[PDB]
Design an enzyme around this catalytic site. Structure first.
Site, mmCIF file in Angstrom:
data_model
loop_
_atom_site.group_PDB
_atom_site.id
_atom_site.type_symbol
_atom_site.label_atom_id
_atom_site.label_comp_id
_atom_site.label_asym_id
_atom_site.label_seq_id
_atom_site.Cartn_x
_atom_site.Cartn_y
_atom_site.Cartn_z
ATOM 1 N N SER A 196 22.431 -29.990 12.542
ATOM 2 C CA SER A 196 21.627 -29.446 13.621
ATOM 3 C C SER A 196 20.507 -28.546 13.086
ATOM 4 O O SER A 196 20.288 -27.465 13.621
ATOM 5 C CB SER A 196 22.523 -28.694 14.582
ATOM 6 O OG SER A 196 22.997 -27.470 14.007
ATOM 7 N N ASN A 256 14.275 -23.457 22.475
ATOM 8 C CA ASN A 256 14.799 -23.637 21.130
ATOM 9 C C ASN A 256 16.315 -23.866 21.131
ATOM 10 O O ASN A 256 16.824 -24.418 20.167
ATOM 11 C CB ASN A 256 14.421 -22.468 20.216
ATOM 12 C CG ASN A 256 14.689 -21.117 20.843
ATOM 13 O OD1 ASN A 256 13.906 -20.638 21.674
ATOM 14 N ND2 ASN A 256 15.793 -20.503 20.449
ATOM 15 N N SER A 293 14.457 -29.176 12.990
ATOM 16 C CA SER A 293 14.500 -27.869 13.633
ATOM 17 C C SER A 293 13.967 -27.958 15.065
ATOM 18 O O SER A 293 13.363 -28.952 15.479
ATOM 19 C CB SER A 293 13.686 -26.849 12.868
ATOM 20 O OG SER A 293 12.311 -27.237 12.923
ATOM 21 N N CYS A 294 14.183 -26.868 15.798
ATOM 22 C CA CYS A 294 13.690 -26.710 17.155
ATOM 23 C C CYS A 294 12.171 -26.847 17.163
ATOM 24 O O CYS A 294 11.621 -27.609 17.957
ATOM 25 C CB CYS A 294 14.166 -25.385 17.751
ATOM 26 S SG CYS A 294 13.967 -23.935 16.666
ATOM 27 N N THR A 295 11.507 -26.172 16.217
ATOM 28 C CA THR A 295 10.054 -26.160 16.146
ATOM 29 C C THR A 295 9.504 -27.542 15.790
ATOM 30 O O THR A 295 8.536 -28.002 16.385
ATOM 31 C CB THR A 295 9.571 -25.113 15.122
ATOM 32 O OG1 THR A 295 10.184 -23.869 15.454
ATOM 33 C CG2 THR A 295 8.069 -24.917 15.150
ATOM 34 N N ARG A 349 12.913 -9.944 8.934
ATOM 35 C CA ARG A 349 14.026 -10.294 9.814
ATOM 36 C C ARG A 349 15.095 -9.195 9.760
ATOM 37 O O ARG A 349 15.997 -9.164 10.591
ATOM 38 C CB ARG A 349 14.607 -11.689 9.498
ATOM 39 C CG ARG A 349 13.783 -12.861 10.031
ATOM 40 C CD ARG A 349 14.421 -14.249 9.894
ATOM 41 N NE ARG A 349 14.429 -14.747 8.522
ATOM 42 C CZ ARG A 349 15.306 -15.615 7.984
ATOM 43 N NH1 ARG A 349 16.361 -16.037 8.665
ATOM 44 N NH2 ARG A 349 15.141 -16.038 6.738
ATOM 45 N N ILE A 354 24.229 -23.206 19.022
ATOM 46 C CA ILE A 354 23.867 -24.615 19.161
ATOM 47 C C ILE A 354 25.101 -25.463 19.444
ATOM 48 O O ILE A 354 25.058 -26.363 20.287
ATOM 49 C CB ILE A 354 23.093 -25.108 17.934
ATOM 50 C CG1 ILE A 354 21.756 -24.376 17.809
ATOM 51 C CG2 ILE A 354 22.926 -26.623 17.982
ATOM 52 C CD1 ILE A 354 20.811 -24.662 18.943
ATOM 53 N N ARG A 397 37.191 -22.675 6.913
ATOM 54 C CA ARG A 397 35.867 -22.335 6.410
ATOM 55 C C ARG A 397 35.344 -23.443 5.485
ATOM 56 O O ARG A 397 34.133 -23.562 5.279
ATOM 57 C CB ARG A 397 35.890 -20.948 5.743
ATOM 58 C CG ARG A 397 36.512 -20.916 4.353
ATOM 59 C CD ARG A 397 36.730 -19.499 3.836
ATOM 60 N NE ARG A 397 37.552 -18.759 4.782
ATOM 61 C CZ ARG A 397 37.590 -17.436 4.913
ATOM 62 N NH1 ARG A 397 36.864 -16.652 4.139
ATOM 63 N NH2 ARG A 397 38.351 -16.898 5.849
ATOM 64 N N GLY A 454 8.702 -23.451 7.652
ATOM 65 C CA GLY A 454 8.782 -24.771 7.040
ATOM 66 C C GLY A 454 8.734 -25.886 8.089
ATOM 67 O O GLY A 454 8.788 -27.061 7.749
ATOM 68 N N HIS A 506 8.386 -17.226 19.045
ATOM 69 C CA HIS A 506 9.736 -17.778 19.077
ATOM 70 C C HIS A 506 10.723 -16.688 19.496
ATOM 71 O O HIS A 506 10.640 -15.554 19.027
ATOM 72 C CB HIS A 506 10.069 -18.343 17.688
ATOM 73 C CG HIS A 506 11.271 -19.232 17.598
ATOM 74 N ND1 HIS A 506 12.557 -18.836 17.902
ATOM 75 C CD2 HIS A 506 11.369 -20.525 17.239
ATOM 76 C CE1 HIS A 506 13.397 -19.855 17.706
ATOM 77 N NE2 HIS A 506 12.701 -20.890 17.283
HETATM 78 N N1 LIG Z 1 17.463 -21.663 18.410
HETATM 79 C C1 LIG Z 1 18.546 -21.865 17.692
HETATM 80 O O1 LIG Z 1 19.490 -21.041 17.708
HETATM 81 C C2 LIG Z 1 18.550 -23.066 16.789
HETATM 82 C C3 LIG Z 1 17.746 -24.157 17.110
HETATM 83 C C4 LIG Z 1 17.760 -25.280 16.317
HETATM 84 C C5 LIG Z 1 18.598 -25.331 15.215
HETATM 85 N N2 LIG Z 1 19.397 -24.266 14.888
HETATM 86 C C6 LIG Z 1 20.289 -24.364 13.707
HETATM 87 O O2 LIG Z 1 21.614 -24.663 14.130
HETATM 88 C C7 LIG Z 1 22.561 -24.012 13.240
HETATM 89 C C8 LIG Z 1 23.401 -23.040 14.013
HETATM 90 O O3 LIG Z 1 22.533 -22.015 14.535
HETATM 91 P P1 LIG Z 1 23.052 -21.080 15.720
HETATM 92 O O4 LIG Z 1 21.879 -20.371 16.287
HETATM 93 O O5 LIG Z 1 24.039 -21.842 16.556
HETATM 94 O O6 LIG Z 1 23.934 -20.027 14.885
HETATM 95 P P2 LIG Z 1 25.313 -19.276 15.171
HETATM 96 O O7 LIG Z 1 25.371 -18.870 16.600
HETATM 97 O O8 LIG Z 1 25.493 -18.269 14.092
HETATM 98 O O9 LIG Z 1 26.330 -20.494 14.958
HETATM 99 C C9 LIG Z 1 27.043 -20.650 13.714
HETATM 100 C C10 LIG Z 1 28.494 -20.879 14.051
HETATM 101 O O10 LIG Z 1 29.151 -21.411 12.885
HETATM 102 C C11 LIG Z 1 30.270 -20.623 12.595
HETATM 103 N N3 LIG Z 1 30.512 -20.752 11.170
HETATM 104 C C12 LIG Z 1 29.855 -20.145 10.128
HETATM 105 N N4 LIG Z 1 30.300 -20.532 8.956
HETATM 106 C C13 LIG Z 1 31.320 -21.426 9.248
HETATM 107 C C14 LIG Z 1 32.193 -22.171 8.435
HETATM 108 N N5 LIG Z 1 32.163 -22.141 7.107
HETATM 109 N N6 LIG Z 1 33.058 -23.016 9.041
HETATM 110 C C15 LIG Z 1 33.081 -23.047 10.378
HETATM 111 N N7 LIG Z 1 32.336 -22.368 11.245
HETATM 112 C C16 LIG Z 1 31.462 -21.566 10.608
HETATM 113 C C17 LIG Z 1 29.932 -19.239 13.120
HETATM 114 O O11 LIG Z 1 31.112 -18.467 13.322
HETATM 115 P P3 LIG Z 1 30.869 -16.892 13.067
HETATM 116 O O12 LIG Z 1 29.785 -16.390 14.061
HETATM 117 O O13 LIG Z 1 32.226 -16.323 13.341
HETATM 118 O O14 LIG Z 1 30.440 -16.750 11.667
HETATM 119 C C18 LIG Z 1 29.279 -19.616 14.442
HETATM 120 O O15 LIG Z 1 30.195 -19.920 15.488
HETATM 121 C C19 LIG Z 1 21.713 -23.374 12.125
HETATM 122 O O16 LIG Z 1 21.517 -24.289 11.050
HETATM 123 C C20 LIG Z 1 20.399 -23.098 12.860
HETATM 124 O O17 LIG Z 1 19.228 -23.122 12.079
HETATM 125 C C21 LIG Z 1 19.398 -23.145 15.690
#
Ligand SMILES: NC(=O)c1ccc[n+]([C@@H]2O[C@H](COP(=O)([O-])OP(=O)(O)OC[C@H]3O[C@@H](n4cnc5c(N)ncnc54)[C@H](OP(=O)(O)O)[C@@H]3O)[C@@H](O)[C@H]2O)c1
Ligand SMILES: NC(=O)c1ccc[n+]([C@@H]2O[C@H](COP(=O)([O-])OP(=O)(O)OC[C@H]3O[C@@H](n4cnc5c(N)ncnc54)[C@H](OP(=O)(O)O)[C@@H]3O)[C@@H](O)[C@H]2O)c1
Ligand SMILES: NC(=O)c1ccc[n+]([C@@H]2O[C@H](COP(=O)([O-])OP(=O)(O)OC[C@H]3O[C@@H](n4cnc5c(N)ncnc54)[C@H](OP(=O)(O)O)[C@@H]3O)[C@@H](O)[C@H]2O)c1
Ligand SMILES: NC(=O)c1ccc[n+]([C@@H]2O[C@H](COP(=O)([O-])OP(=O)(O)OC[C@H]3O[C@@H](n4cnc5c(N)ncnc54)[C@H](OP(=O)(O)O)[C@@H]3O)[C@@H](O)[C@H]2O)c1
Lengths: 334, 336, 335, 335
Positions: free
Chosen positions: B120, B314, B151-153, B197, B12, B78, B211, B179
């Site tokens: 997000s 999404n 959320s996306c949904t 999952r 995201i 972190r 949710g 999804h």
């Molecule tokens: N369809 C979707 O993907 C979608 C849609 C809507 C909302 N969201 C939400 O958006 C958020 C991110 O989802 P995503 O799909 O983008 O996941 P993701 O690809 O895992 O993105 C998370 C990112 O945060 C980093 N990270 C984790 N812990 C951290 C910390 N303490 N400090 C700094 N960086 C950190 C991760 O690095 P590492 O990979 O190295 O750990 C990664 O780059 C979640 O809350 C998710 O529910 C996702």
């Protein structure tokens, strides 16, 4: 009964447990160490996206799982030195975590009461590396205590390499393995030490280093410095092929290459190496117990250069190889 | 220009970065924090398995990346309390790590000198939750400082539920979102808190809770207690559909249901909710900028029971919604 | 034994063949008609991307295959009026080509010497349609000669709808089946009469119409007019789920809904409908012999609106239902 | 403007349509022949599972589609003899049906009023075969009228092979192409003349034969008889790699092999062959305009044996080579 413990109840660990149940009459898994809690661990034993439902009843509690009415002790130590294999009279530990491929770390199982450790991968500092059917005669029951069963790829390449080297002599060769994605690849583009394995595995052709053609050197010393290779990870969940291109001073044809494999692929060696003239695709070799399934229809010969291709189920085929080697360790002195 | 920071440069985060470049003329991302080293971070920015190559040059050094010749400060902390956003005159931080959806934790960004944080995802303890186009008019620049873009949904369901609830009245509905798999899921059968999952994502239909239907209540309180649902994760990399089945006391037809959306899907709201009569499949909505793409061809009515279906990217669609919300925030007062 | 013929040796035809070998003690397939040549047909019997290798020897020649030593006559007639089942003393023909679901075409098998035709799909102009365990008791061995075993989806939906209708009463319900891609879909964007099914199956969620919810009405006339739905084809090669959302006048909970299925899923009927509280994903129900595997974990209730979800292996599950229907036919008068 | 017709509006035909719009300022597609009604055809033009939505507006009627305001005549003639390209002042026809690769069939486009036919595949009986960047300077505008743009694999292999042969000398070589599945493969296990291509494409690695390594000889005669290979089809919808293992008498290193590609891959030739040190995966070369993307990180050397790997988008990359060829034809004498 020779009592076995598994450290790392992942794909290979769970493959191995099912292989023991199905193909062994003298081994018993009595203890398992793994990061998962017992609910997750028993669930993943019972249900398998590749292998289907386990054929036996599974229950769990705080300290164990119970499978076909046999209690199996379960631990969750990050560090092997905090295990006690002696407590359960465990003779051999399958080290399949992927994080203790250094024998100097995997040695810790022996401190913790194991007699033998078999690493389910290429190792460093190991007593010895084996491909069953290729070099297992060289197993020293006294001095070979922390050993490697090599890689899935090595278990495919070496049996075929040996047959063709023995018959015609390999001068040089280069390998491409086209290989199912594995669990260390990422599902979505994400952090990885390997920038290609970082990339969404189920929609990418992913080149990655292999090692498992040089590792043939450890198993076929005759071929040291003569073989190299790499993998292309592709979107199938299991099932792989090793494509070897090599030169030989011999006069060879498609037919003579193929006949050399056919004539070796017999008897007990024939449980490691199979010879096929069938119109194989990857799904046909899923859950095949051979280390190497030679595909005669893919042999090519251009002058003194030969291309040959062998299949392998990198999960089950490798595991069956790993178990053959485990049986050899158990049958000798501990 | 309002200067933006991203915490969590994942799917995201990186979508959002590209969305700003493509779709904004008044926001600039000047600082990023993530777990990755600069080589890996720049690499995953340059190359994307879904979005393709970044159309701008990317370089990196020991504490920055440079994108189209613009230097972006990069951190690997972190704990967000170890960041300083005021150091780069950053007003708004996107919180897209996924581990700070508790606004009490995300507040660390405010103490580190940001004026606004936008989480997000669904949040806990947040000042306010928004689906752009549904309830963004309620945004309070003074008091809504750590907010959720849902959320996306929820961004797909809420626009559609609002229109149909307003016109016909929704007694109760239940949703299935079919999804795309997401990063939480496992490539091979392996450890996960959710036992489904845990299962190999790209060869399985995987049921899992969301949710997202109960969360519609945060943005449409009239629908409190009236909606629930779950997801089926399937083997596509992005692109999703929400299938809502509801009961109404109104007399409705397929035609009146569709006419209601078509009427509503205009002007600025039409940037959030589109009405389609096209023969859509998921790849047709990949990289679509709407939160909700209503598929008229899928509507069914049986007595007082209605099924409607809306698509969404999404990743990209949700991201465009989040960017709309970010643009709103950036247009109104930004004080400590 | 009763001698069976298969017309259309495709996914369902080959599933059926394997199901007979594994599950039947009184049926033997003695003759197959299909478009493929014998080399190709034998290859696809022996090797299966879903079910793995056949555990018997397979040989072929110019007009047969031989399976575990049993010779099976093979034909390749596009038009079934050119076949002759009587020459092989075939009593029952499984009509699984997909192209003869009109009983007025399928009945050519009877003209060609068969006594019974079971179509592996919704039919038109047929004598009867059945979902085994739901309405097979109505089978009339004298008058039901060209019949339908209905669709994969109906065989999943109908058992669960019956149980819940009987208990609580279904006012109306709408279904979504999230379904494995099937051979009617294109691999690459290409010609199709359905412009969604035209689209690359393995990278798309593809909406497509199923008549399978309205077809419950043939099997449960109490529900005529009360059910409708559609399908979303998704990229798994087999394994599907039917998601039914319905309203009821009864006061119901997740527990009472789940209890009603658990109660019902017990006997002979329990071979058609199972009750699961397991953490199921699609791969777990691949090669399951049930028509309908009810997933108690996915039941939801909001006011009077109920959502239930049942799994099925659209190949093997459906096939096992078809086999159950065939066994019933084989167990009664073949005049 | 030189006006172009497309015969066969499939994967390559529709890629070619989009490539003209994206990459040409001097060609226009003004007529298309395929197998489809204009609703179907316009739908598949507008929406693409790989290339995404067309950016231009698309309308249709009984006789035509209109794209971005430009009326394009559409036909559905099985036999090209029944077309009239001259009525649309079409100079060049792209023959992308896959069924007229014999130039003695393809030349019917010339009887039908075109001046040049470019077959989007290996051909037989053709005037000439070209890999743009490799041998297009031998194009003879007078005598080269029904020509081949070679295969996807040949457009990847030949550019890399020429550079390395020119520098070091290739004695012999065997190739493996790891290749995205194509429309000819089956989604489910089903009839095919190739018993492996019969097998469900999106869950199998599928070995199949290609003449692409031998066909390098048409374009580089020095390499006649020296190269052979085959293909492994794998579950990605587009994007491929060609892995060539070859012997040379030259003394070579990984560094010297890579250096030779890098010094060649510049200027016009560099639009055909790119040199990369990036951590490429298949999705990184989707919609890449190059015929051949050499991956320096995969080069291996063992003695006098060399392995090199080059990527290609078998759809877009090939199509961009075909457009380069078309542009050349368009730039020289058309009668
Ligand atoms: N369809 C979707 O993907 C979608 C849609 C809507 C909302 N969201 C939400 O958006 C958020 C991110 O989802 P995503 O799909 O983008 O996941 P993701 O690809 O895992 O993105 C998370 C990112 O945060 C980093 N990270 C984790 N812990 C951290 C910390 N303490 N400090 C700094 N960086 C950190 C991760 O690095 P590492 O990979 O190295 O750990 C990664 O780059 C979640 O809350 C998710 O529910 C996702
Ligand atoms: N898969 C193949 O095709 C294949 C073939 C041949 C050889 N191998 C080798 O086999 C090994 C395992 O691979 P895999 O595919 O089975 O991977 P995997 O599924 O990730 O298995 C590793 C398992 O070890 C657990 N684990 C990790 N660190 C641990 C620790 N310190 N103590 C205890 N348990 C720990 C993991 O738990 P969590 O999941 O909870 O972290 C997981 O269950 C690797 O060396 C691999 O190269 C794999
Ligand atoms: N999940 C499922 O797949 C599913 C479930 C339930 C019911 N069904 C139904 O069962 C039927 C078969 O579906 P399927 O998936 O098995 O399709 P399929 O794999 O295409 O099977 C059809 C078979 O019939 C052959 N055939 C076609 N026309 C023929 C003719 N005129 N004479 C003889 N053989 C002919 C085909 O050969 P060619 O391949 O050479 O054309 C093919 O082997 C359809 O009615 C379908 O709706 C399917
Ligand atoms: N795809 C690749 O990666 C690739 C790469 C390089 C070269 N090529 C070559 O390009 C050619 C086309 O391949 P493709 O992948 O584009 O295949 P495709 O998707 O099947 O395209 C062929 C098109 O031609 C139509 N067609 C068939 N016969 C026709 C006729 N007699 N008159 C008019 N239209 C007709 C087809 O309609 P129907 O489907 O209804 O028959 C379809 O729209 C082949 O020669 C192939 O080898 C393909």
């Amino acid at each position: 009964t020779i009592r076995v413990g598994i450290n790392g109840f992942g794909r290979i660990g769970r493959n191995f447990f099912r292989a023991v149940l199905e193909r062994s009459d003298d081994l018993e898994v009595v203890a398992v160490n793994d990061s998962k809690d017992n609910k997750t661990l028993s669930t993943l034993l019972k249900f398998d996206s590749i292998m289907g439902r386990l054929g036996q009843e599974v229950e769990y509690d705080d300290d164990s799982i119970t499978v076909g009415g046999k209690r199996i002790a379960v631990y969750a130590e990050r560090d092997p030195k905090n295990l006690d294999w002696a407590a359960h009279n465990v003779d051999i530990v399958i080290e399949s975590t992927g994080v203790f491929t250094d024998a100097n770390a995997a040695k810790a199982h022996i401190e913790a009461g194991a007699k033998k450790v078999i690493i389910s991968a290429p190792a460093s500092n190991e007593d010895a590396t084996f491909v069953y059917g290729v070099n297992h005669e060289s197993y020293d029951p006294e001095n070979h205590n922390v050993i490697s069963g090599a890689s899935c790829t090595t278990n495919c390449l070496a049996p075929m390499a040996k047959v063709l080297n023995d018959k015609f002599g390999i001068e040089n060769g280069l390998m491409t393995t086209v290989h199912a994605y594995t669990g260390d690849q990422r599902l979505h583009d994400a952090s990885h030490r390997d920038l290609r394995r970082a990339r969404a595995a189920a929609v990418n052709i992913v080149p990655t280093s292999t090692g498992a053609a040089k590792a043939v050197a450890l198993v076929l010393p005759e071929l040291k410095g003569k073989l190299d290779g790499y993998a292309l990870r592709v979107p199938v969940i299991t099932g792989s092929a090793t494509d070897l291109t090599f030169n030989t001073k011999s006069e060879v044809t498609v037919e003579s290459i193929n006949a050399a494999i056919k004539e070796a692929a017999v008897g007990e060696f024939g449980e490691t190496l199979a010879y096929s003239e069938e119109p194989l695709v990857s799904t046909d070799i899923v859950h095949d117990s051979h280390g190497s399934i030679f595909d005669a229809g893919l042999t090519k010969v251009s002058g003194n250069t030969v291309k040959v291709v062998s299949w392998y189920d990198n999960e089950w085929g490798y595991t069956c190889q790993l178990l053959r080697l485990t049986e050899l360790v158990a049958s000798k002195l501990l």
